[PDB]
């Protein structure tokens with residue numbers, strides 16, 4: 001049975017987050033919290049060509065509690081830091097999987113080397129919800145190098161698929177997750193197709209970053225457009241009308257309340273009050 005298309009969304013207008021992240025917001029939990037669980041948010045930064053500068057372009061220090069932050073870099077370099085000292089630089093092909101859990105205080109910005117040279121800048125920011133029993137887990141980092149991400153060639157020379165989280169054809173993703181989910185990065189060659197088998201009941205989305213994609217032989221998605229699929233079903237097929245780049249997100253739904261405000265995503269409104277109180281009380285970190 002097919003995971004049939006139940007919603008397709010046009011490219012959103014771009015807004016600026018800080019001075020370093022020109023993003024198009026694909027979805028958020030306010031409107032797609034139940035339908036996209038475990039995924040809370042997807043921003044698509046760029047593509048943008050940045051000029052050399054002495055500025056440190058990025059976003060200021062800000063808190064997070066109750067979920068995980070995933071940064072997938074395609075072009076450019078970003079550096080992340082937190083008030084603890086946990087830091088690092090994410091370059092092309094690299095992934096950072098950040099667990100905010102109990103609470104974190106961090107900032108993201110263009111790396112010092114990217115500031116000097118400029119050039120293409122493109123990446124995805126994804127938020128992954130935590131089960132209630134884990135929403136206060138210790139904050140943790142996972143700097144995932146491009147080399148450590150399996151790259152599986154697709155049958156019929158259709159393209160390749162990077163297994164960031166989950167599993168595909170026996171190749172296991174390096175991302176450590178708290179609940180069952182897949183995060184795949186797919187290049188599909190024009191004229192080629194591929195059919196996938198996913199777990200029944202898993203919420204599934206396709207986000208097209210480049211190209212023209214025909215989903216289940218019906219809907220067509222292009223740059224910055226998103227297909228939301230029926231979670232009831234185990235199958236889907238994609239075809240590349242042009243050389244395509246897409247993200248495939250799929251996960252077992254977290255059947256728990258979502259109460260979120262800005263940087264805090266918890267289970268109860270009382271937990272959001274506690275979160276804001278901790279942050280303004282200086283107890284956050």
Ligand SMILES: [Cl-]
Pocket residue numbers: 055056
């Ligand atoms: Cl500086």
Ligand SMILES: [Fe+3]
Pocket residue numbers: 069106107108
């Ligand atoms: Fe952040």
